[PDB]
């Protein structure tokens, strides 16, 4: 349980608050100004957790906020795990930020946790393979958007798991788990691409989208990539998993593009809808 702290505006507590306040202001592009910690609690957890009630003005106007700061001084670690204006319907939700290494074992475990969760709830037998993409969001805690590949009935398919985790509590929970559609198998070895949304790759995916548009009389509107995989052959082949809107509806597609630069050769060999349709 929490515990009252008999020194609200302590230098180290005034420290914690402005750390939170600084991040919010920047991540959100705002200008909260810290005045005074009104109240401070403390919970011994995986490390310490401080629930901080403080006063801030936002261009002259008096406002009360609350933040939950997770700290592990033995790692030089402090993460803001909630930030909220009293009262408001909810906590201040952060932007949905993309995470460049979707297969860092911590997300592989999130993914597996979600796959098993679904296996129990649906009496199913899905089989994880890899993550294609992870997005993170500051909520009350963290929410991860995982786009994964799982083998079902022997066939690779793409699923999306939304999972909520309060890491200081060792707590996690599936918020949403849904089938997107069929994955298209790569066959052979591949190299991953750490940043699937570099200009190089955004231009290739846009090329394929226009190619598909022209060829099927469609009007897909490119949004971004989720994942890029490469392999050297004669020239290079890119396997691109991307989102496009089709009449405002977000869809996922898989493109296969074959490039031979000395030939000025660029060819879309496969472009397929995964799902969301």
mmCIF file of C-alpha atoms in Angstrom:
data_model
loop_
_atom_site.group_PDB
_atom_site.id
_atom_site.type_symbol
_atom_site.label_atom_id
_atom_site.label_comp_id
_atom_site.label_asym_id
_atom_site.label_seq_id
_atom_site.Cartn_x
_atom_site.Cartn_y
_atom_site.Cartn_z
ATOM 1 C CA UNK A 1 0.000 0.000 0.000
ATOM 2 C CA UNK A 2 0.968 3.657 -0.367
ATOM 3 C CA UNK A 3 2.356 5.808 2.447
ATOM 4 C CA UNK A 4 2.141 9.518 3.339
ATOM 5 C CA UNK A 5 5.380 11.478 2.869
ATOM 6 C CA UNK A 6 5.950 14.175 5.536
ATOM 7 C CA UNK A 7 7.935 16.448 3.212
ATOM 8 C CA UNK A 8 5.857 17.471 0.149
ATOM 9 C CA UNK A 9 8.059 20.195 -1.393
ATOM 10 C CA UNK A 10 11.379 18.455 -0.623
ATOM 11 C CA UNK A 11 14.235 19.262 -3.084
ATOM 12 C CA UNK A 12 14.199 15.660 -4.236
ATOM 13 C CA UNK A 13 10.408 15.682 -4.452
ATOM 14 C CA UNK A 14 10.382 19.029 -6.260
ATOM 15 C CA UNK A 15 12.967 17.239 -8.421
ATOM 16 C CA UNK A 16 10.682 14.326 -9.272
ATOM 17 C CA UNK A 17 7.762 16.565 -10.181
ATOM 18 C CA UNK A 18 9.620 18.795 -12.622
ATOM 19 C CA UNK A 19 11.016 15.654 -14.256
ATOM 20 C CA UNK A 20 7.465 14.574 -14.943
ATOM 21 C CA UNK A 21 6.424 18.121 -15.829
ATOM 22 C CA UNK A 22 9.382 18.520 -18.230
ATOM 23 C CA UNK A 23 8.532 15.322 -20.139
ATOM 24 C CA UNK A 24 4.833 16.125 -20.434
ATOM 25 C CA UNK A 25 5.470 19.682 -21.712
ATOM 26 C CA UNK A 26 7.882 18.344 -24.359
ATOM 27 C CA UNK A 27 6.139 15.138 -25.480
ATOM 28 C CA UNK A 28 2.876 17.076 -25.637
ATOM 29 C CA UNK A 29 4.181 20.502 -26.669
ATOM 30 C CA UNK A 30 2.672 22.395 -23.740
ATOM 31 C CA UNK A 31 3.834 24.743 -20.959
ATOM 32 C CA UNK A 32 2.848 23.621 -17.436
ATOM 33 C CA UNK A 33 4.634 25.514 -14.687
ATOM 34 C CA UNK A 34 5.311 23.735 -11.382
ATOM 35 C CA UNK A 35 4.422 25.666 -8.222
ATOM 36 C CA UNK A 36 4.259 23.226 -5.294
ATOM 37 C CA UNK A 37 3.850 19.574 -4.385
ATOM 38 C CA UNK A 38 0.575 19.414 -2.513
ATOM 39 C CA UNK A 39 0.902 15.840 -1.328
ATOM 40 C CA UNK A 40 3.288 12.952 -1.827
ATOM 41 C CA UNK A 41 2.723 9.266 -1.284
ATOM 42 C CA UNK A 42 5.106 6.387 -1.734
ATOM 43 C CA UNK A 43 4.644 2.694 -2.574
ATOM 44 C CA UNK A 44 7.384 0.098 -2.206
ATOM 45 C CA UNK A 45 7.154 -1.992 -5.372
ATOM 46 C CA UNK A 46 9.701 -3.215 -7.954
ATOM 47 C CA UNK A 47 11.705 -0.334 -6.639
ATOM 48 C CA UNK A 48 9.768 2.689 -5.404
ATOM 49 C CA UNK A 49 6.584 4.259 -6.750
ATOM 50 C CA UNK A 50 5.656 7.823 -5.889
ATOM 51 C CA UNK A 51 2.146 9.155 -6.363
ATOM 52 C CA UNK A 52 2.574 12.931 -6.507
ATOM 53 C CA UNK A 53 -0.121 15.555 -6.116
ATOM 54 C CA UNK A 54 1.173 18.968 -7.118
ATOM 55 C CA UNK A 55 0.092 22.447 -8.188
ATOM 56 C CA UNK A 56 0.834 23.827 -11.633
ATOM 57 C CA UNK A 57 -0.245 26.884 -13.601
ATOM 58 C CA UNK A 58 -0.752 26.761 -17.333
ATOM 59 C CA UNK A 59 -0.424 30.357 -18.432
ATOM 60 C CA UNK A 60 -1.636 32.033 -15.255
ATOM 61 C CA UNK A 61 -4.398 29.594 -14.360
ATOM 62 C CA UNK A 62 -4.191 27.507 -11.193
ATOM 63 C CA UNK A 63 -4.448 23.767 -11.832
ATOM 64 C CA UNK A 64 -3.871 20.597 -9.837
ATOM 65 C CA UNK A 65 -2.291 17.533 -11.430
ATOM 66 C CA UNK A 66 -1.185 14.079 -10.230
ATOM 67 C CA UNK A 67 1.642 11.898 -11.411
ATOM 68 C CA UNK A 68 2.948 8.429 -10.676
ATOM 69 C CA UNK A 69 6.679 8.093 -10.930
ATOM 70 C CA UNK A 70 8.451 4.799 -10.926
ATOM 71 C CA UNK A 71 12.025 4.862 -9.648
ATOM 72 C CA UNK A 72 14.844 2.313 -9.308
ATOM 73 C CA UNK A 73 17.850 4.308 -8.065
ATOM 74 C CA UNK A 74 20.105 1.245 -8.465
ATOM 75 C CA UNK A 75 19.741 1.460 -12.240
ATOM 76 C CA UNK A 76 19.537 5.230 -12.530
ATOM 77 C CA UNK A 77 15.935 4.707 -13.627
ATOM 78 C CA UNK A 78 12.879 6.949 -13.449
ATOM 79 C CA UNK A 79 9.888 6.643 -15.725
ATOM 80 C CA UNK A 80 6.647 8.576 -15.595
ATOM 81 C CA UNK A 81 3.904 5.951 -15.473
ATOM 82 C CA UNK A 82 0.880 8.231 -15.278
ATOM 83 C CA UNK A 83 0.217 11.991 -15.522
ATOM 84 C CA UNK A 84 -3.267 13.333 -14.963
ATOM 85 C CA UNK A 85 -5.201 16.563 -14.480
ATOM 86 C CA UNK A 86 -7.647 16.358 -11.591
ATOM 87 C CA UNK A 87 -10.335 15.720 -12.339
ATOM 88 C CA UNK A 88 -10.731 14.921 -16.056
ATOM 89 C CA UNK A 89 -12.406 11.749 -17.334
ATOM 90 C CA UNK A 90 -8.980 10.176 -17.828
ATOM 91 C CA UNK A 91 -5.198 10.305 -17.594
ATOM 92 C CA UNK A 92 -3.247 12.280 -20.185
ATOM 93 C CA UNK A 93 -2.612 9.667 -22.908
ATOM 94 C CA UNK A 94 0.686 9.992 -24.778
ATOM 95 C CA UNK A 95 1.397 9.677 -28.476
ATOM 96 C CA UNK A 96 1.651 6.192 -29.933
ATOM 97 C CA UNK A 97 5.374 5.920 -30.435
ATOM 98 C CA UNK A 98 7.021 3.298 -32.673
ATOM 99 C CA UNK A 99 9.646 1.024 -31.159
ATOM 100 C CA UNK A 100 12.539 0.183 -33.487
ATOM 101 C CA UNK A 101 13.326 -3.378 -32.205
ATOM 102 C CA UNK A 102 9.977 -5.260 -32.169
ATOM 103 C CA UNK A 103 11.779 -8.519 -31.327
ATOM 104 C CA UNK A 104 13.620 -7.363 -28.148
ATOM 105 C CA UNK A 105 12.767 -10.370 -25.935
ATOM 106 C CA UNK A 106 10.516 -8.251 -23.709
ATOM 107 C CA UNK A 107 8.084 -7.786 -26.586
ATOM 108 C CA UNK A 108 8.425 -11.361 -27.661
ATOM 109 C CA UNK A 109 7.240 -12.232 -24.143
ATOM 110 C CA UNK A 110 4.386 -9.734 -24.307
ATOM 111 C CA UNK A 111 3.426 -11.284 -27.621
ATOM 112 C CA UNK A 112 3.606 -14.821 -26.312
ATOM 113 C CA UNK A 113 1.642 -13.837 -23.241
ATOM 114 C CA UNK A 114 -1.095 -12.507 -25.517
ATOM 115 C CA UNK A 115 -1.052 -15.597 -27.758
ATOM 116 C CA UNK A 116 -1.476 -17.947 -24.793
ATOM 117 C CA UNK A 117 -4.152 -15.673 -23.333
ATOM 118 C CA UNK A 118 -6.147 -16.046 -26.517
ATOM 119 C CA UNK A 119 -5.403 -19.766 -26.646
ATOM 120 C CA UNK A 120 -7.068 -20.197 -23.252
ATOM 121 C CA UNK A 121 -10.010 -17.861 -23.810
ATOM 122 C CA UNK A 122 -10.785 -19.367 -27.220
ATOM 123 C CA UNK A 123 -9.597 -22.946 -26.648
ATOM 124 C CA UNK A 124 -7.270 -22.372 -29.594
ATOM 125 C CA UNK A 125 -3.745 -23.383 -30.598
ATOM 126 C CA UNK A 126 -1.994 -20.366 -32.079
ATOM 127 C CA UNK A 127 1.758 -20.552 -32.446
ATOM 128 C CA UNK A 128 3.876 -17.372 -32.147
ATOM 129 C CA UNK A 129 6.653 -16.838 -34.655
ATOM 130 C CA UNK A 130 7.806 -13.202 -34.508
ATOM 131 C CA UNK A 131 6.698 -9.596 -34.045
ATOM 132 C CA UNK A 132 6.438 -7.383 -37.132
ATOM 133 C CA UNK A 133 5.974 -4.173 -35.180
ATOM 134 C CA UNK A 134 5.530 -2.699 -31.701
ATOM 135 C CA UNK A 135 4.117 0.641 -30.803
ATOM 136 C CA UNK A 136 4.178 1.948 -27.275
ATOM 137 C CA UNK A 137 1.887 4.464 -25.541
ATOM 138 C CA UNK A 138 1.986 6.131 -22.125
ATOM 139 C CA UNK A 139 -1.422 5.497 -20.538
ATOM 140 C CA UNK A 140 -2.062 4.766 -16.888
ATOM 141 C CA UNK A 141 0.948 2.591 -17.297
ATOM 142 C CA UNK A 142 1.970 1.489 -20.800
ATOM 143 C CA UNK A 143 -0.076 0.095 -23.678
ATOM 144 C CA UNK A 144 1.743 -1.772 -26.456
ATOM 145 C CA UNK A 145 0.359 -2.288 -29.948
ATOM 146 C CA UNK A 146 1.897 -5.496 -31.201
ATOM 147 C CA UNK A 147 1.538 -6.685 -34.759
ATOM 148 C CA UNK A 148 2.704 -10.328 -34.704
ATOM 149 C CA UNK A 149 2.857 -13.445 -36.853
ATOM 150 C CA UNK A 150 1.315 -16.606 -35.420
ATOM 151 C CA UNK A 151 0.959 -20.034 -36.973
ATOM 152 C CA UNK A 152 -2.658 -21.177 -36.942
ATOM 153 C CA UNK A 153 -3.772 -24.556 -38.269
ATOM 154 C CA UNK A 154 -0.332 -24.625 -39.869
ATOM 155 C CA UNK A 155 -0.698 -21.264 -41.671
ATOM 156 C CA UNK A 156 1.110 -18.034 -40.835
ATOM 157 C CA UNK A 157 -1.328 -15.239 -40.031
ATOM 158 C CA UNK A 158 -0.987 -11.666 -38.755
ATOM 159 C CA UNK A 159 -2.650 -10.684 -35.462
ATOM 160 C CA UNK A 160 -2.720 -7.426 -33.461
ATOM 161 C CA UNK A 161 -2.497 -7.475 -29.678
ATOM 162 C CA UNK A 162 -3.103 -4.446 -27.498
ATOM 163 C CA UNK A 163 -1.618 -5.159 -24.143
ATOM 164 C CA UNK A 164 -1.599 -3.014 -20.978
ATOM 165 C CA UNK A 165 1.332 -3.339 -18.612
ATOM 166 C CA UNK A 166 2.119 -1.904 -15.228
ATOM 167 C CA UNK A 167 5.700 -3.120 -15.074
ATOM 168 C CA UNK A 168 6.386 -2.043 -11.477
ATOM 169 C CA UNK A 169 3.572 -4.396 -10.436
ATOM 170 C CA UNK A 170 4.605 -7.197 -12.774
ATOM 171 C CA UNK A 171 1.020 -6.687 -14.103
ATOM 172 C CA UNK A 172 -0.089 -7.261 -17.678
ATOM 173 C CA UNK A 173 -3.361 -7.892 -19.469
ATOM 174 C CA UNK A 174 -4.703 -8.257 -23.003
ATOM 175 C CA UNK A 175 -6.950 -5.287 -23.871
ATOM 176 C CA UNK A 176 -7.596 -6.433 -27.462
ATOM 177 C CA UNK A 177 -6.475 -9.413 -29.586
ATOM 178 C CA UNK A 178 -7.584 -9.677 -33.209
ATOM 179 C CA UNK A 179 -6.890 -11.488 -36.490
ATOM 180 C CA UNK A 180 -5.706 -9.220 -39.280
ATOM 181 C CA UNK A 181 -5.299 -11.795 -42.072
ATOM 182 C CA UNK A 182 -2.879 -14.145 -43.845
ATOM 183 C CA UNK A 183 0.861 -13.620 -43.799
ATOM 184 C CA UNK A 184 2.700 -14.312 -47.052
ATOM 185 C CA UNK A 185 5.696 -16.613 -46.367
ATOM 186 C CA UNK A 186 9.124 -15.386 -47.392
ATOM 187 C CA UNK A 187 10.995 -18.594 -48.314
ATOM 188 C CA UNK A 188 14.728 -18.460 -47.671
ATOM 189 C CA UNK A 189 16.821 -16.240 -45.412
ATOM 190 C CA UNK A 190 16.274 -12.556 -44.733
ATOM 191 C CA UNK A 191 17.796 -9.465 -43.160
ATOM 192 C CA UNK A 192 15.690 -7.256 -40.925
ATOM 193 C CA UNK A 193 15.500 -3.499 -41.263
ATOM 194 C CA UNK A 194 15.717 -1.674 -37.921
ATOM 195 C CA UNK A 195 13.885 1.426 -39.208
ATOM 196 C CA UNK A 196 11.267 0.420 -41.779
ATOM 197 C CA UNK A 197 10.215 4.044 -42.202
ATOM 198 C CA UNK A 198 13.415 5.591 -43.595
ATOM 199 C CA UNK A 199 12.969 7.594 -46.859
ATOM 200 C CA UNK A 200 14.569 4.766 -48.830
ATOM 201 C CA UNK A 201 11.825 2.399 -47.753
ATOM 202 C CA UNK A 202 8.956 4.903 -47.692
ATOM 203 C CA UNK A 203 9.710 5.616 -51.364
ATOM 204 C CA UNK A 204 9.728 1.917 -52.237
ATOM 205 C CA UNK A 205 6.401 1.318 -50.468
ATOM 206 C CA UNK A 206 4.906 4.419 -52.139
ATOM 207 C CA UNK A 207 6.132 3.058 -55.461
ATOM 208 C CA UNK A 208 4.346 -0.209 -54.841
ATOM 209 C CA UNK A 209 1.179 1.523 -53.695
ATOM 210 C CA UNK A 210 1.064 3.680 -56.828
ATOM 211 C CA UNK A 211 1.854 0.553 -58.838
ATOM 212 C CA UNK A 212 -1.070 -1.319 -57.342
ATOM 213 C CA UNK A 213 -3.318 1.724 -57.729
ATOM 214 C CA UNK A 214 -2.591 2.178 -61.428
ATOM 215 C CA UNK A 215 -2.906 -1.585 -62.058
ATOM 216 C CA UNK A 216 -6.173 -2.360 -60.237
ATOM 217 C CA UNK A 217 -7.754 1.081 -60.651
ATOM 218 C CA UNK A 218 -7.509 1.635 -56.889
ATOM 219 C CA UNK A 219 -6.878 4.672 -54.746
ATOM 220 C CA UNK A 220 -5.086 3.349 -51.690
ATOM 221 C CA UNK A 221 -3.543 6.104 -49.593
ATOM 222 C CA UNK A 222 -0.140 5.175 -48.101
ATOM 223 C CA UNK A 223 0.254 5.760 -44.366
ATOM 224 C CA UNK A 224 3.572 4.236 -43.223
ATOM 225 C CA UNK A 225 5.459 0.957 -43.009
ATOM 226 C CA UNK A 226 5.217 -1.614 -40.204
ATOM 227 C CA UNK A 227 8.129 -3.778 -41.225
ATOM 228 C CA UNK A 228 10.779 -4.333 -43.892
ATOM 229 C CA UNK A 229 12.752 -7.486 -44.627
ATOM 230 C CA UNK A 230 15.504 -7.828 -47.243
ATOM 231 C CA UNK A 231 17.390 -10.449 -49.150
ATOM 232 C CA UNK A 232 20.198 -10.318 -51.672
ATOM 233 C CA UNK A 233 19.759 -12.281 -54.866
ATOM 234 C CA UNK A 234 20.332 -10.781 -58.274
ATOM 235 C CA UNK A 235 19.795 -7.244 -57.077
ATOM 236 C CA UNK A 236 17.609 -7.028 -53.975
ATOM 237 C CA UNK A 237 14.142 -8.133 -52.899
ATOM 238 C CA UNK A 238 12.237 -6.148 -50.286
ATOM 239 C CA UNK A 239 9.285 -7.587 -48.371
ATOM 240 C CA UNK A 240 7.306 -4.627 -47.081
ATOM 241 C CA UNK A 241 4.395 -4.787 -44.610
ATOM 242 C CA UNK A 242 2.623 -1.429 -44.790
ATOM 243 C CA UNK A 243 -0.600 0.371 -43.870
ATOM 244 C CA UNK A 244 -2.702 2.112 -46.467
ATOM 245 C CA UNK A 245 -6.120 3.676 -46.139
ATOM 246 C CA UNK A 246 -8.810 2.443 -48.488
ATOM 247 C CA UNK A 247 -11.573 5.070 -48.362
ATOM 248 C CA UNK A 248 -10.464 6.112 -44.907
ATOM 249 C CA UNK A 249 -10.336 2.550 -43.565
ATOM 250 C CA UNK A 250 -6.812 1.565 -42.392
ATOM 251 C CA UNK A 251 -5.647 -1.597 -44.120
ATOM 252 C CA UNK A 252 -2.487 -3.714 -43.997
ATOM 253 C CA UNK A 253 -0.727 -4.887 -47.145
ATOM 254 C CA UNK A 254 2.317 -6.953 -47.999
ATOM 255 C CA UNK A 255 4.411 -5.891 -50.981
ATOM 256 C CA UNK A 256 7.224 -7.800 -52.651
ATOM 257 C CA UNK A 257 9.532 -5.608 -54.667
ATOM 258 C CA UNK A 258 12.505 -6.637 -56.804
ATOM 259 C CA UNK A 259 15.185 -4.011 -57.449
ATOM 260 C CA UNK A 260 18.249 -4.210 -59.698
ATOM 261 C CA UNK A 261 19.865 -0.735 -59.593
ATOM 262 C CA UNK A 262 22.506 -1.121 -62.367
ATOM 263 C CA UNK A 263 19.500 -1.862 -64.624
ATOM 264 C CA UNK A 264 17.328 0.939 -63.191
ATOM 265 C CA UNK A 265 15.074 -2.028 -62.570
ATOM 266 C CA UNK A 266 12.261 -1.759 -60.047
ATOM 267 C CA UNK A 267 9.378 -4.205 -60.143
ATOM 268 C CA UNK A 268 6.467 -5.049 -57.811
ATOM 269 C CA UNK A 269 6.250 -8.816 -57.979
ATOM 270 C CA UNK A 270 3.565 -9.170 -55.236
ATOM 271 C CA UNK A 271 1.167 -6.710 -53.563
ATOM 272 C CA UNK A 272 -1.479 -8.309 -51.319
ATOM 273 C CA UNK A 273 -4.109 -7.224 -48.799
ATOM 274 C CA UNK A 274 -3.666 -8.759 -45.351
ATOM 275 C CA UNK A 275 -6.850 -7.428 -43.762
ATOM 276 C CA UNK A 276 -8.869 -4.914 -41.765
ATOM 277 C CA UNK A 277 -11.202 -4.781 -44.793
#
